[PDB]
Write a protein that binds this ligand. Structure first.
Ligand SMILES: COC(=O)c1cc(N)cc(-c2c(C)noc2C)c1
Ligand SMILES: [Cl-]
Length: 130
């Protein structure tokens, strides 16, 4: 219905705002664009599903997220990819892992504070009905 399309449009608006707030945070700069193959050529061979915040914005706009849970799966993938690819003890790896965990935790905390659980539930029920 038009009511349902309005619900998904509101979801997109909400997700874009959250993603923008993550993307402008200087700690998360490394997650704002895909990893550069020129710089890291083995990335695309090791990490099977690359994800970054620009790709997340693209996916919102393509209506790929019908629930906050679908969205958080991609935030989680940004984080898990960084933990997997940078697992070492050295400071460079430890810094990126800390930032990756912060990205994930920040996204979850924004959603916890600002998403009404009944709004998420409605999205889930519309999605499940399709
Ligand atoms: C576009 O992404 C970057 O600018 C960038 C920069 C650094 N220093 C590391 C990484 C990176 C990520 C994210 N995951 O593994 C590496 C290496 C990406
Ligand atoms: Cl830095």
């Amino acid at each position: 219905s038009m009511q349902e399309e309005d619900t998904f449009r509101e979801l997109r608006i909400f997700l874009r705002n959250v993603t923008h707030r993550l993307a402008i945070d200087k700690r998360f700069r490394v997650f704002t664009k895909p990893v550069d193959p020129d710089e890291v050529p083995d990335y695309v061979t090791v990490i099977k599903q690359p994800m970054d915040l620009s790709s997340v914005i693209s996916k919102i706009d393509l209506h790929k997220y019908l629930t906050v849970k679908d969205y958080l799966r991609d935030i989680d993938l940004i984080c898990s990819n960084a933990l997997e690819y940078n697992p070492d003890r050295d400071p460079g790896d430890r810094l990126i892992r800390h930032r990756a965990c912060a990205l994930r935790d920040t996204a979850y905390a924004i959603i916890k504070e600002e998403l009404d659980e009944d709004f998420e539930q409605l999205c889930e029920e519309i999605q499940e009905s399709r």
